[PDB]
A paper describes a structure:
Mutation of C9ORF72 is the most common genetic cause of amyotrophic lateral sclerosis (ALS) and frontal temporal degeneration (FTD), which is attributed to both a gain and loss of function. C9orf72 exists in cells as a stable heterotrimer with Smith–Magenis chromosome regions 8 (SMCR8) and WD repeat-containing protein 41 (WDR41). C9orf72 forms a complex with SMCR8 and WDR41, which was reported to have GTPase activating protein activity toward ARF proteins, RAB8A, and RAB11A. Two cryo-electron microscopy structural studies of the C9orf72:SMCR8:WDR41 complex found that SMCR8 is sandwiched between C9orf72 and WDR41.
We determined the cryo-EM structure of ARF1-GDP-BeF3- bound to C9orf72:SMCR8:WDR41. We were able to obtain a 3.9-Å cryo-EM reconstruction from an untilted dataset combined with 30° and 40° stage tilted datasets. The reconstruction showed that ARF1 sits in a 25 Å-wide concave pocket generated by the SMCR8longin and C9orf72longin domains. The ARF1 switch I and switch II regions, which are conformationally sensitive to the nucleotide state, directly contact the parallel helices of the SMCR8longin-C9orf72longin dimer. Relative to C9orf72, SMCR8longin has the more extensive interface with ARF1. ARF1 is in its GTP-bound conformation, with respect to all three of the regions whose conformation depends on the nucleotide state: the switch I, switch II, and interswitch regions. SMCR8 Arg147 points directly toward the BeF3−, as predicted by the arginine finger model (left). ARF1 switch II sits on the parallel helices of the two longin domains and the loop of SMCR8longin, while switch I binds only to SMCR8longin. C9orf72W33G/D34K:SMCR8:WDR41 complex was found to almost completely abolish GAP activity toward ARF1. Our observation of a catalytically competent monomeric complex does show that the monomer is the minimal entity capable of GAP activity.
Author numbering:
A (entry chain B): 51 to 63, 80 to 110, 115 to 143, 147 to 219, 225 to 254, 328 to 375, 706 to 714, 716 to 789, ...
B (entry chain E): 15 to 180
C (entry chain C): 13 to 34, 43 to 101, 104 to 148, 172 to 302, 306 to 321, 374 to 465
D (entry chain A): 29 to 57, 62 to 94, 103 to 120, 124 to 150, 153 to 203, 207 to 262, 283 to 354, 395 to 457
Write the structure that this text describes.
């Protein structure tokens, strides 16, 4: 009860692309019954002709671009249909505008191509016919100088045919495997991004339409995986790690067992706010006695226990929070409301389901940061009064709780540094910090 | 009193479309092999002859049955130059005349395209058409050429003379 | 056989006609580009192609031709059915240059024609009065939108936004309730207004919350003609006559898959088809809208709505094997989706239907 | 925990630990590489590199471009651009100071040269060891200490030729000299390498103090018209000036040996230690911890203070840190975006 996703036929007296001649075309859709059905009058140097088909038992038709191929040999007939088909009716109608252009370019490739190839056949043919005419006008002409009336009649017929060929060749110049390879490649490309349902395709265009307007606030999580990440939310007392990651404090992950370190260093990289043109300021598998500059533009790093270093790294305890894996030891005491909803005892299944949850709930904070950074009745005008109003604005308008506020102005600093420099901490190191105490959890 | 539906059929590359063009305008134009059908009619001797050009493709050979209604005259054209697939053509003819759906309609075998001396007078052509073999049928054949454009007229005259009695 | 008729405004339609087997309608204008016989020649191709009468009981098999040989778009819905059980259906013609205009309107044109044919077949059993009676409204709806309706790229120049004023007690409640009702009515509602500039302003304002393609699925207001409650458009502006009664058929409106008045200022969703929006309403006024900084924050709320809707669809579609079992999951669905308010849940659900229809039934309908 | 300086900019452009930081102008200030920076932005504007061995001093002559000397027994005059000139007499000098009122400047021997970089006068072979210090004195006098012997080589103003005669000598100290500063026009402080603290009278040139009830290698002493503060090893000890005793002491100071101390203008005293930790201190009614600044793995030489910008603190781990106030820095960042968007137009245009 299925249907193919490409076809091509020329009915007189074929071809695939679903999965490079996929074998699964289950026995409810005949290979050439629809080819017989699409055989229709339409088309009578010509030009393009789009169409649509009707339902049946039980697959709806789709874009059936019909275009003549070239001059074969009946003089120029070449009924080449680059038919497409799908089992979702409304999808073709809704996406017709986008679907048309790709097939149009594909067919224009064949037109700018195989027309040239007929080209050569015509050329040679006349060349061969002209050679025959030269042989006639030399040898047969000498023989006449030496019945011959029939030879002259044949020569006249050949000259007329040669004139016809010359005129046809001159006309075919006109604007109107060297090329077939990229045409099949482009057909495969057309098949490529439409595999999904229309439900996802509509969003894939609506979101792309929206994001070209939020040019300023998009640099945080524009992104230019879950199951392990979900398990990190089987690991108890992991909540403050998210806050440390969000607030700008470096979260050093230190331990042996390369595999687990690489499992977590990329799983937790979704939560890292960006800096600028650089993709992500994440360091993979750092190995050194470390320096302060190393903490500047590497937002988080991973070290290894060469069987300690807790006293060696505990001197820099005001700038980073330390995570140790095997001992399950690991941030300020945090009683918030923002991140607990970002990661709960959730009954969510599947990996990518949680990724979209995070991606949706993250942009809300981006909008909040935009508001805080670009309200004029706050930054514009005593230090005591301005601090009081800034601290009280978030208690009422944005509805935040206690220490959760800290991340907001951090992100805001990112935005304002972006607006002018576009390079916060890459060539002009900032390295913001605080004097909050800490605590250790077993 | 003026209607005449004709199921004009034929084999591939038979120029039956050129026959229809001769009947309509009497002029030769290049023809792309027709895909579905054409609808034209000619009025002659106070009766309008309605002729539908069809396709003779082997894939659509088991498709003419969908045109097997409302036609009284089963005019069929067989090539004479192509001394091949004549048995296949005969089998197709007997299979399209054996069903009671077309039993009401009256048969009219016909030929064309004398052309080169390879195909000659209709004795053996009609023999391979087996005119004497059929039972409960009628047949009357002329030799016609499109270039000269002569012969179709007497075919129409015979159609009229032998069918106006109903 | 053409019966030339005229209507106010420029003519988008180029023709419209019928079909037989052994064009009476035309947009009367000046210097038609293609002759009368051309309509017939075009009509034969679209008509003389059925042959294979593979129909069980009867349905509208909508076709669509973009036939660039002459530059004409053809739409038809052929059905079987008098004297003989033949097949025949209407047809509609548009010119090539008016290509993008029809595409958003296909889903309403097909429904209108289907209802028209369903009426005609009723009178066929037990011929041309109905044919001409229900051919002008179809040619009126599409002709009206030629130079009206809100385009996609609308600024905040004539919006309720860009006001520098939050409004009184009644204004805030009216605005918040209007936006809540719109978002909870799947985005299909028309505005009634006594005045002209007020209705146009509020309609253009409320149209900012829709997709760009959806914008062409609208109807601007005017005080000249007499429009009708076309039950296929999303946002429609109109003017009410001094009689005191709106022309709103009950059957046409109810069959759709709200009422907002500029004068009395009370929104009511009498025919059927929250804190997230409250926050947006309360905060958007606290910024300076002169320098466009208030425009950008508009997009964020809609984006957060779309993504929160898509995640609910995915969470519903993976809790069962693309549909193989009862859902029986409400508390868990509400808790983890960061939406405990019933209004917020309904708002999130509303954006889902625009992508995946039938989900309301599938979940709890 | 109160305390200023919430932001920490980091600079890295040097190959060796540079122990000298000298003010240059309003906005601008051992491998022989001279680099200057912008206090606000942090951009390494321009660069100077002409030395071979380690540099020995850096000063300014208000013009007021640069004046640096190294271990190559030659003094060069850089500006910025194009170098002015270079001076090489015989040996290498470890001290240099400019006399403002006399409008002259001077360098095993002492040589004073005019603004034309020409040695106007020069003494004979003073001693086998170099000049440990050079402190300006009232009445066009120059005071220097050579290890265990300190001689006030006075300079006679210019028939208009400059002259220089030493007018006094002392032997009270039993060790080498560490540092000496001129506390206003009051007196001259003397310190012994063994840790003995002494004073020198301005015009009387008479010793008037000796404190020894404290490794005792007191390095730097910071003082003003109020009281004398000095550091020795692992304890910060304040010796009273007027009342002439020890006013304030703090035994539990930084665990390493202090290197340089100074007093902030708004009444606090900061400390630099060998351990790399710099802590601020506030004077009380007879002191307490003010804050902590953990900045490097190794020591820090000296700190330079800016009125409205912050501090410069690094010499060891080949770095430079410009500590800032933060909060006050954010406000200046805010008032430059709002005042720019109005002139620009909309957000994106
Ligand atoms: N020489 C010659 N050619 C013929 C004759 N009748 C038909 N043809 C050819 O038939 C061709 C057209 O065939 P076509 O219309 O495509 O197929 P059909 O309609 O099924 O017969 C033309 O190119 C003619 O040359 C004839 O009597 N003589
Ligand atoms: F000319 Be076709 F064979 F109908
Ligand atoms: Mg033919």
């Amino acid at each position: 009860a299925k249907f193919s996703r490409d076809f091509i036929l020329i009915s007189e007296f074929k071809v695939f692309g679903t999965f490079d001649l996929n074998y699964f075309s289950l026995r409810i859709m005949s290979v050439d019954y629809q080819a017989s059905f699409v055989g229709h009058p339409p088309g009578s140097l010509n030009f393009v002709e789009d169409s649509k088909v009707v339902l049946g038992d039980s697959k709806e038709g789709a874009f059936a671009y019909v275009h003549h191929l070239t001059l074969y040999d009946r003089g120029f007939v070449r009924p080449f249909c680059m038919a497409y088909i799908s089992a979702d009716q409304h999808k073709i109608m809704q996406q017709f505008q986008e679907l048309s252009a790709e097939f149009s370019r594909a067919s224009e490739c064949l037109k700018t191509g195989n027309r040239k190839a007929f080209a050569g056949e015509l050329e040679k043919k006349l060349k061969d016919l002209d050679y025959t005419r030269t042989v006639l006008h030399t040898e047969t002409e000498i023989q006449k100088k030496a019945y011959s009336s029939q030879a002259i009649e044949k020569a006249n017929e050949l000259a007329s045919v040669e004139k016809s060929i010359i005129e046809h060749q001159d006309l075919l110049k006109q604007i109107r495997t060297e090329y077939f390879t990229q045409t099949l490649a482009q057909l495969s490309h057309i098949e490529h991004m439409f595999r999904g349902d229309l439900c996802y395709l509509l969003t894939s265009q609506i979101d792309r339409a929206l994001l070209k307007q939020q040019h300023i606030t998009n640099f945080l999580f524009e992104d230019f995986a879950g199951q392990n990440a979900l398990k990190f939310i089987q690991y108890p007392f992991a909540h403050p790690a998210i806050y440390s990651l969000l607030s700008g404090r470096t979260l050093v992950v230190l331990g042996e067992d390369e595999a687990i370190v690489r499992k977590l260093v990329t799983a937790l990289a979704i939560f890292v706010p960006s800096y600028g043109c650089y993709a992500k300021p994440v360091k993979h598998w750092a190995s050194s006695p470390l320096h302060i500059m190393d903490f500047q533009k590497w937002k988080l790093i991973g070290l290894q226990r060469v069987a300690g270093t807790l006293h060696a790294l505990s001197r820099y305890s005001r700038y980073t929070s330390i995570l140790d894996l095997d001992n399950k030891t690991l941030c300020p005491l945090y009683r918030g409301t923002l991140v607990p909803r970002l990661a709960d005892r959730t009954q969510i299944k599947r990996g990518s389901t949680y990724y979209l949850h995070v991606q949706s709930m993250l942009t809300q904070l981006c909008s909040k940061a935009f508001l805080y950074t670009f309200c004029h009745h706050l930054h514009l005008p005593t230090e005591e009064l301005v601090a009081s109003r800034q601290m009280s604005f978030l208690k009422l308008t944005l509805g935040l709780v206690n220490e959760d506020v800290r991340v907001v102005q951090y992100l805001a600093e990112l935005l304002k540094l972006h607006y002018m420099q576009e390079s916060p901490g890459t060539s002009h190191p900032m390295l913001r910090f605080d004097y909050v105490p800490s605590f250790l959890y077993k | 009193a003026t209607e005449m539906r004709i199921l004009m059929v034929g084999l591939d590359a038979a120029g039956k479309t050129t026959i229809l063009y001769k009947l309509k305008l009497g002029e030769i134009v290049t023809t792309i092999p027709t895909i579905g059908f054409n609808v034209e009619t000619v009025e002659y001797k106070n009766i309008s002859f309605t002729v539908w050009d069809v396709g003779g493709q082997d894939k659509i050979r088991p498709l003419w049955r969908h045109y097997f209604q409302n036609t009284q005259g089963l005019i069929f054209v067989v090539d004479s130059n192509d001394r091949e697939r004549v048995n296949e053509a005969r089998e197709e003819l007997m299979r399209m005349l054996a069903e009671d759906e077309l039993r009401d309609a009256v048969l009219l075998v016909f030929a064309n395209k004398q052309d080169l001396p390879n195909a000659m007078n209709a004795a053996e052509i009609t023999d391979k058409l087996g005119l004497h073999s059929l039972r409960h049928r009628n047949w009357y054949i002329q030799a016609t050429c499109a270039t000269s454009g002569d012969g179709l007229y007497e075919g129409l005259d015979w159609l009229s003379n032998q069918l106006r009695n109903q | 056989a053409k019966t030339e008729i005229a209507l106010s405004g420029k003519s988008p339609l180029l023709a419209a006609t019928f079909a037989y087997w052994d064009h009476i309608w035309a947009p009367k204008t000046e210097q038609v580009l293609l002759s009368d016989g051309e309509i017939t020649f075009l009509a034969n191709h679209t008509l003389n192609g059925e042959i294979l009468r593979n129909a069980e009981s009867g349905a509208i098999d909508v076709k669509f031709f973009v036939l660039s040989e002459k530059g004409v778009i053809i739409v038809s819905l052929i059905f079987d059915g008098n004297g003989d059980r033949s097949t025949y259906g209407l047809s509609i013609i548009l010119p090539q240059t008016e290509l993008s205009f029809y595409l958003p309107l296909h889903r309403v044109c097909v429904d209108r024609l289907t209802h028209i044919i369903r009426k005609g077949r009723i009178w066929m059993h037990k011929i041309i009065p109905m044919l001409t009676g229900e051919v002008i409204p179809v040619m009126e709806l599409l002709s009206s939108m030629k130079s009206h309706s809100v385009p996609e790229e609308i600024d905040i120049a004539d919006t309720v936004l860009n006001d520098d004023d939050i409004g009184d007690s009644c204004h805030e409640g009216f605005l918040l309730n209007a936006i809540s009702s719109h978002l909870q009515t799947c985005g299909c509602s028309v505005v009634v207004g006594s005045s002209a500039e007020k209705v146009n302003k509020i309609v253009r304002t409320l149209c900012l919350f829709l997709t760009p393609a959806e914008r062409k699925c609208s109807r601007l207001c005017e005080a000249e003609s007499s429009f009708k409650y076309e039950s296929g458009l999303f946002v429609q502006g109109l003017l009410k006559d001094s009689t005191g009664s709106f022309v709103l058929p009950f059957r046409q409106v109810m069959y759709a898959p709200t009422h907002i008045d500029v004068d009395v200022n009370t929104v009511k969703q009498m025919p059927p088809c929250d804190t997230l929006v409250k926050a947006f309403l309360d905060q958007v006024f606290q910024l300076k809208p002169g320098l466009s900084l208030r425009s950008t924050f508009l997009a964020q709320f809609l984006l957060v709505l779309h993504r929160k809707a898509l995640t609910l669809i995915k969470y519903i579609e993976d809790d069962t094997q693309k549909g193989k079992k009862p859902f029986k999951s409400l508390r868990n669905l509400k808790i983890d989706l960061d939406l405990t308010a019933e209004g917020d849940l309904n708002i999130i659900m509303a954006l889902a239907e625009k992508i995946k229809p039938g989900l309301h039934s599938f979940i709890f309908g | 925990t109160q305390n200023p300086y919430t932001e920490l900019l980091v600079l890295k452009a040097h190959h060796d630990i540079v122990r000298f930081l000298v003010q240059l102008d309003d906005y601008r200030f051992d491998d022989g590489i001279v680099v200057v920076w912008n206090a606000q932005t942090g951009e390494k504007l321009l660069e100077l590199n002409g030395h071979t061995q380690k540099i020995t001093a850096i000063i300014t002559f208000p013009n007021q471009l640069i004046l640096t000397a190294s271990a190559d027994r030659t003094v060069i005059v850089w500006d910025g651009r194009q170098v002015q000139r270079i001076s090489c007499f015989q040996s290498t000098v470890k001290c240099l100071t400019v006399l403002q009122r006399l409008d002259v400047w001077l360098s095993n021997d002492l040589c004073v040269w005019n603004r034309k970089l020409d040695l106007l006068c020069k003494t004979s072979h003073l001693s086998d060891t170099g000049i440990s210090a050079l402190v300006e004195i009232p009445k066009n006098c120059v005071v220097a200490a050579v290890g265990k012997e300190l001689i006030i080589f006075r300079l006679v103003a210019p028939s208009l030729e400059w002259d220089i005669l030493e007018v006094k000598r002392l032997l009270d100290h039993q060790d080498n000299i560490l540092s000496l500063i001129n506390v206003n026009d009051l007196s001259f402080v003397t310190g012994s390498h063994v840790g003995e603290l002494i004073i020198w009278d301005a015009l009387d040139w008479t010793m008037q103090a000796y404190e020894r009830n404290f490794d005792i290698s007191i390095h730097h002493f910071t003082c003003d018209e109020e009281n004398v503060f000095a550091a020795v090893g692992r304890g910060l000890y304040v010796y009273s000036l007027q009342m002439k005793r020890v006013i304030a002491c703090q035994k539990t100071a930084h665990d390493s040996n202090v290197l340089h101390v100074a007093r902030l203008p708004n009444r606090q005293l900061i400390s630099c230690s060998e351990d790399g930790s710099v802590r601020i201190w506030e004077l009380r009614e007879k002191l307490e911890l003010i804050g902590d600044l953990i900045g490097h793995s190794s020591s820090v030489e000296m700190f330079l203070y800016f009125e409205d910008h912050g501090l410069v603190t690094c010499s060891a781990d080949h770095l430079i840190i410009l500590w800032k106030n933060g909060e006050r820095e954010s406000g200046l960042r805010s008032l430059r975006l709002f005042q720019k968007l109005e002139e620009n137009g909309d957000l994106y245009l």
